[PDB]
Amino acid sequence: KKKVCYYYDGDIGNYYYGQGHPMKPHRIRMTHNLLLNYGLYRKMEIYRPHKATAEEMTKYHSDEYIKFLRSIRPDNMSEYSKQMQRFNVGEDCPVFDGLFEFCQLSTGGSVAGAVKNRQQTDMAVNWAGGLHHAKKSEASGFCYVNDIVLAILELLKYHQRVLYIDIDIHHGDGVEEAFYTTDRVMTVSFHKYGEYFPGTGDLRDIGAGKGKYYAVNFPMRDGIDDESYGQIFKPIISKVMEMYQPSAVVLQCGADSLSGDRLGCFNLTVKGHAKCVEVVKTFNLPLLMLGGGGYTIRNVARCWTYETAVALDCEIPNELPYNDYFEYFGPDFKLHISPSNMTNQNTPEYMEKIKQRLFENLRMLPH
Amino acid sequence: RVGPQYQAVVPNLGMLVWSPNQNLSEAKLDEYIAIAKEKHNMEQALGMLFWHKHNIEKSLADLPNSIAKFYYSWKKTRT
Amino acid sequence: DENYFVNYTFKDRSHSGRVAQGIMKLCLEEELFADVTISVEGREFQLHRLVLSAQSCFFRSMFTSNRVIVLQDVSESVFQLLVDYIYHGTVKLRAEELQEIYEVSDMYQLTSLFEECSRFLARTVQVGNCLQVMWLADRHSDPELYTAAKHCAKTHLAQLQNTEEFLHLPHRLLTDIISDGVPCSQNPTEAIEAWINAESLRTSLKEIGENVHIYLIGKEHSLAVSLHCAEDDSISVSGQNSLCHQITAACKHGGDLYVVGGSIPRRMWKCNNATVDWEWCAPLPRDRLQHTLVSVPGKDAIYSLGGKTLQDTLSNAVIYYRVGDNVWTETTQLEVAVSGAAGANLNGIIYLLGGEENDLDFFTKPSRLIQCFDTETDKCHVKPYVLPFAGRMHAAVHKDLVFIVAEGDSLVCYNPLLDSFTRLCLPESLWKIASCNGSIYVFRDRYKANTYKLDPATSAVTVTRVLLTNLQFVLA
Amino acid sequence: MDENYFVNYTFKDRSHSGRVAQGIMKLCLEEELFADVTISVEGREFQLHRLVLSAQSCFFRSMFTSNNRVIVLQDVSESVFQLLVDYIYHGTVKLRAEELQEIYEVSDMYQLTSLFEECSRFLARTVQVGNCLQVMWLADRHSDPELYTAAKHCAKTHLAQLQNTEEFLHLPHRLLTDIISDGVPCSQNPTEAIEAWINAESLRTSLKEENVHIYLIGKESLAVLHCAEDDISVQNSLCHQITAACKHGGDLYVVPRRMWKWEWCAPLPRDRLQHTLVSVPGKDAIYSLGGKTLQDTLSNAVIYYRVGDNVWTETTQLEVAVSGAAGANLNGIIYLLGGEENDLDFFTKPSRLIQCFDTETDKCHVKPYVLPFAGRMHAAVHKDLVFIVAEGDSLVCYNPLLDSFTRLCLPEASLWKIASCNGSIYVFRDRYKANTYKLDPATSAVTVTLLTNLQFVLA
Numbered sequence A: 001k002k003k004v005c006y007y008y009d010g011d012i013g014n015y016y017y018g019q020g021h022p023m024k025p026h027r028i029r030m031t032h033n034l035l036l037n038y039g040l041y042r043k044m045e046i047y048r049p050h051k052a053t054a055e056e057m058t059k060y061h062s063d064e065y066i067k068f069l070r071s072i073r074p075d076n077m078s079e080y081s082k083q084m085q086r087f088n089v090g091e092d093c094p095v096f097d098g099l100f101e102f103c104q105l106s107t108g109g110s111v112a113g114a115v116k117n118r119q120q121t122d123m124a125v126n127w128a129g130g131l132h133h134a135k136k137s138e139a140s141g142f143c144y145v146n147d148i149v150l151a152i153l154e155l156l157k158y159h160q161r162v163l164y165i166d167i168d169i170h171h172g173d174g175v176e177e178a179f180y181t182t183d184r185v186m187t188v189s190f191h192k193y194g195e196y197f198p199g200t201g202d203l204r205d206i207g208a209g210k211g212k213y214y215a216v217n218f219p220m221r222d223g224i225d226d227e228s229y230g231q232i233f234k235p236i237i238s239k240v241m242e243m244y245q246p247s248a249v250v251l252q253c254g255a256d257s258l259s260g261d262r263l264g265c266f267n268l269t270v271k272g273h274a275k276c277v278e279v280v281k282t283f284n285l286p287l288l289m290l291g292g293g294g295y296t297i298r299n300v301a302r303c304w305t306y307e308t309a310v311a312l313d314c315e316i317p318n319e320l321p322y323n324d325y326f327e328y329f330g331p332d333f334k335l336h337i338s339p340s341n342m343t344n345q346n347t348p349e350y351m352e353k354i355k356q357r358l359f360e361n362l363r364m365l366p367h
Numbered sequence B: 001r002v003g004p005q006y007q008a009v010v011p012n013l014g015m016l017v018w019s020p021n022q023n024l025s026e027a028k029l030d031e032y033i034a035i036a037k038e039k040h041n042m043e044q045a046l047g048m049l050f051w052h053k054h055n056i057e058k059s060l061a062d063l064p065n066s067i068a069k070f071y072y073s074w075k076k077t078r079t
Numbered sequence C: 001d002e003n004y005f006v007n008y009t010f011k012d013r014s015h016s017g018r019v020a021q022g023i024m025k026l027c028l029e030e031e032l033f034a035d036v037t038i039s040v041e042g043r044e045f046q047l048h049r050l051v052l053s054a055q056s057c058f059f060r061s062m063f064t065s066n067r068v069i070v071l072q073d074v075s076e077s078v079f080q081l082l083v084d085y086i087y088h089g090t091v092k093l094r095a096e097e098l099q100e101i102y103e104v105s106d107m108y109q110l111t112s113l114f115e116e117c118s119r120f121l122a123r124t125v126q127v128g129n130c131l132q133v134m135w136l137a138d139r140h141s142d143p144e145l146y147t148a149a150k151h152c153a154k155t156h157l158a159q160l161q162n163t164e165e166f167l168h169l170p171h172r173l174l175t176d177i178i179s180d181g182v183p184c185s186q187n188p189t190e191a192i193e194a195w196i197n198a199e200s201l202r203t204s205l206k207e208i209g210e211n212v213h214i215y216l217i218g219k220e221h222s223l224a225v226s227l228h229c230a231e232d233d234s235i236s237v238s239g240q241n242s243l244c245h246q247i248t249a250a251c252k253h254g255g256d257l258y259v260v261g262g263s264i265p266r267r268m269w270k271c272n273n274a275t276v277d278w279e280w281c282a283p284l285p286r287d288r289l290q291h292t293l294v295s296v297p298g299k300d301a302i303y304s305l306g307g308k309t310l311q312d313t314l315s316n317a318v319i320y321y322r323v324g325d326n327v328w329t330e331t332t333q334l335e336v337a338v339s340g341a342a343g344a345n346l347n348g349i350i351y352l353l354g355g356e357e358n359d360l361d362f363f364t365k366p367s368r369l370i371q372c373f374d375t376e377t378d379k380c381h382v383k384p385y386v387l388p389f390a391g392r393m394h395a396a397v398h399k400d401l402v403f404i405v406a407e408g409d410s411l412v413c414y415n416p417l418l419d420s421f422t423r424l425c426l427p428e429s430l431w432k433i434a435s436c437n438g439s440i441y442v443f444r445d446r447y448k449a450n451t452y453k454l455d456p457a458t459s460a461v462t463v464t465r466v467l468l469t470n471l472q473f474v475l476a
Numbered sequence D: 001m002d003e004n005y006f007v008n009y010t011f012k013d014r015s016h017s018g019r020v021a022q023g024i025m026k027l028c029l030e031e032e033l034f035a036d037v038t039i040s041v042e043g044r045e046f047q048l049h050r051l052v053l054s055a056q057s058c059f060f061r062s063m064f065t066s067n068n069r070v071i072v073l074q075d076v077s078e079s080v081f082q083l084l085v086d087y088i089y090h091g092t093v094k095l096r097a098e099e100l101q102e103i104y105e106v107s108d109m110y111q112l113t114s115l116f117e118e119c120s121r122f123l124a125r126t127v128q129v130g131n132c133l134q135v136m137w138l139a140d141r142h143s144d145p146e147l148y149t150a151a152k153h154c155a156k157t158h159l160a161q162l163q164n165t166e167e168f169l170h171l172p173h174r175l176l177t178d179i180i181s182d183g184v185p186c187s188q189n190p191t192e193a194i195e196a197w198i199n200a201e202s203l204r205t206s207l208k209e210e211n212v213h214i215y216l217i218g219k220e221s222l223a224v225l226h227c228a229e230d231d232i233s234v235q236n237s238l239c240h241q242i243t244a245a246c247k248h249g250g251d252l253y254v255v256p257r258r259m260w261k262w263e264w265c266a267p268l269p270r271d272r273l274q275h276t277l278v279s280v281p282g283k284d285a286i287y288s289l290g291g292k293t294l295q296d297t298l299s300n301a302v303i304y305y306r307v308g309d310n311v312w313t314e315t316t317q318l319e320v321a322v323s324g325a326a327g328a329n330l331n332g333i334i335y336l337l338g339g340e341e342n343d344l345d346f347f348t349k350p351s352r353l354i355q356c357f358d359t360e361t362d363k364c365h366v367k368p369y370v371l372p373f374a375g376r377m378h379a380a381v382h383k384d385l386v387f388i389v390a391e392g393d394s395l396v397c398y399n400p401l402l403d404s405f406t407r408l409c410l411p412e413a414s415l416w417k418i419a420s421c422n423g424s425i426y427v428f429r430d431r432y433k434a435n436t437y438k439l440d441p442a443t444s445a446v447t448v449t450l451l452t453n454l455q456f457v458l459a
């Protein structure tokens, strides 16, 4: 009943970040491969993303930063020595062959999904994108171009109110900073706080100026289980929808939240993770699904395939199909994964207090 | 940081590789894909069928007619 | 204490001290009210019944059971120092007469001096007198001394097999020594066969097997070499495993080497020294650097403490990793945040020394504090006293005390129980130390002599002799 | 040092004092042994010990050495001697107001400085106007500057009723000169009392001479007391918001960086709310501790305020950051009680902790003991101890020297507001609706003696 448009480029997993870097782009292809073998690819509309132009991509990022990204090459690195020390590129963001091509491929699908704002579809699934750390001044984390900001800005052309729901472990400070002042975009992120990578999202900070009571951040502790995660996510998202009435929702489904993640301290299962998509699909609003932080390719592929299947409103067996990447899958060779028994520091009183504080903050939102 | 420059300035041309076919049956499509794989990938067969304006018979008739996978194959073999 | 203005009970906290200062200044400075004369080896001493009964339960029974009390087992000097300890509370122990004072305190039921002498014996146990001290502990039923002597016997039976006292040993002691430990490198079969010149020993002989106890991470393609101290005052090499990564923190738990590092350092690797195939452990759930890792075999855990954050802010976070469960879990936070502080485990108590304390003016001054965290009760507190030097340093636990080597040639021997230090000077750069077998080894930061073997006794340092240009980590 | 732990070192037993104290306590009173001396007091026989008696008291040592049979004292009560023996041996004695002067005199004659100073403090906290002259004479006869000063303060503030008391008439000129040396208020008519005398010129010359001591800030704003007659009397309005306030010798300072006295003062060097403010006169400075920062975070900074030079100077930071605590000043030491402490790293919880700050040495510490009740509390220093009240109608008394608390019942009648006047204690209620009360701590009896709201009370 919902037209699902799937965006993926064939030659997008050939952008290796170098040896030892957790960010593996080829995981996206892995997901696509499963979508070919599970049989759900037939039911979905598959598009080929187009490389976004530099002029179109610099609608948010500065022209100098875009020119720097275009001119950076691994061979021409000796000349570009003083530029890498000010753009946070070289150590946190390694330089690899075809970096600008990878950025264009990631941005194209996200922009096309947002463009098709044209009331021509209902769900747009693009696992190529999801970069939520590229700041305007310079890159940060493992991201280079913040395609999420570009997609949200493109959606702002037609839609009035845009909601950005982030479920990645990291705060995604780039998206919040991009729309911190403006009240056109409301961003709600469920992240891990406390000597972690972002170190920015906290209960005490909200959008400055006109963005007051908009940037809702939910701090968490390690080892939060699926039941508490759902019982927290559902009421807050329901209250936000009732008090903000977004025209469209840009749902970002980071794969760090799954159990056993290389750079994740949470303990979640596939259903516990992708129940948020089920909850948000019940509001009957245009929806955009994007990729993001994923470093356990075996779990990332399964989570993304389950999310796409539940977006299709179909069901798939736990037995994974005999795909090309069926070799390094787990000995059970099953889709769903059993969470590892880890202590949950998220005491019910703490979650209740945070929920009450966020409800009080949302009550002050103008209506 | 407030980032006055950092803050966003608030105010398809896509190639449809494959599209679903309502007329075509799921069993018929699966049989066609299996026959194509046995005789002449699933994505290639789907693209060939889509290029024929969702004509299974036409697709079957036309069925016989550093750099960028290769690195991942070595890792898969080593596994 | 119903009403302070009508009637309440008054408690004097200094009273216990006030009586204490009123005894030494009277019973010793100007001998008065002396009711008893005690003669030992023809040496009369004027003593009071009350003080002796209060301190010692043995003399109280004799008093309650009397012109002059005569003792025979105790000599004059040991009795004099024991009386001085009883009246004052402080005494200078000497290794020459340690056995006599130990047995006298055991006989006289003076637990405070008996436990300290037992720890002294367990601290200075050598292969020459291990059997003798084991027999003495068995006679006096001393658990800690007996198990320390048993450990020494099981780790040096290879040379004890011809010590002329192993042959003339009761069967129970031999069975207890052979009960555990005794690695196959010592050849227990030959010793067991020669002991007869015979079924309980044969049916109860567990071989532990020699394992690597020294790991050197250096060369910055970083290399992780292994050492095995064998023969007599000699070191050997039995492994050149290289992780080919950027290791920034490591800890040695049991016979396995656990290292943390690589690009975006959060992962963890394990090496069992029996193969070059590294095993993968749970990644570190925190983004911290310069955080100390301490291995606790008693709880079979690895504690990561301190360390800076990505925001240039010190973190007072403590997280323990279970070897079996393969799970990281948070615990009680530190009193004060530190970074780079030396961590040492002693009988389940973790000691953090120095580091970089947060200065008042948004700076990181070199710290000198000592903070102790108790694993059993999950509580931590800062020692009132401070270390002589502040800054980066390396700490190693030997016997019941800790050796700390900092910038320069200073080497303290801080004892947690006595709250006292002991200065020692290295031969004439930040040195590093390790505790292998029953000696101390010192490695220089950069070499281009490199290894010095020393023991606390006589403060003697001897040059002893794969080559690593850089030595960023040493684990014992 | 120069002592190898593996060769030669000295061992210090920190439990030796406890061991010997416990042995003396157990082997002397529970079972009497090695007495070797007998003491006769009013027929009662005591089997004491010369060593213990001469240990912490040189009076016995001075006479035991200078010449064994029964010894009879001169003026010691049987119960008094029994409790003295218990204090000497056990170390814990139960002091009672019945035998209070006699034990004080005996402890002065005996060599017991700790018991002597404890009895001195007991007399200082129980001094009354009726028996003020007797305590003054007792302190003058002995060597006790603190009790002498306490008696002088008690007599000076109540010299109006001391004009004819059958003791001031017979009071010697030596004590009268010291009594009139202090600044007796002119409202008590010192001239008439001096002229009463026995019925000279230098005493008349040494007659140096009331100020408001109670201020109520209310009505949300009005700042309005003078305790006169027997067991109160009365309207400046500032209409300015106040987060903290203090009293410094009759100067009502009110605090955000605005300062008023209605005289503008130096601005605060930091913007904080709900920060405790005290007026420690030992260093002649006003101290601000704790509070909440403008970023909704608990503050941990302490800043001075010299009255002579309005220069707010920073100092050592508190070990634990608290907000909304109760600040008490006692002999130059600042006590912070309870407050709002950080919880779950994002919220605030009621806290019952004791923060001791030494201003002379500029040090901070946290006492292990905890308050009986947490939450917002109001404290007042009456006489060498602090009375603390809050919502619940259950007053508590805490003496910092001792490790103990004292509970006291309060009428049910709204958070209470306790004060500390020269006469007695005054407790107020936030809800006017109760009214001004006066409670006697000894008898635990409270007797009854307009602002709708009472947000700050200062004594």
Ligand SMILES: Cn1nnc(-c2ccc3c(c2)[nH]c2nc(Cc4ccccc4)nc(N[C@H]4CC[C@H](N)CC4)c23)n1
Residues within 6 Å of the ligand: A091, A092, A133, A141, A142, A170, A197, A263, A293, C264, C265, C266, C287, C288, C289, C308, C309, C310
């Ligand atoms: C979405 N996402 N997934 N993963 C990350 C992510 C990205 C980066 C890091 C990270 C996680 N953990 C890290 N730990 C450390 C260790 C450390 C701790 C405390 C003090 C000093 C060092 N250094 C990191 N990078 C530096 C940044 C500055 C640059 N000059 C050099 C490289 C990172 N983001």
Ligand SMILES: [Zn+2]
Residues within 6 Å of the ligand: A168, A169, A170, A254, A256, A292, A293, A294
């Ligand atoms: Zn992420």
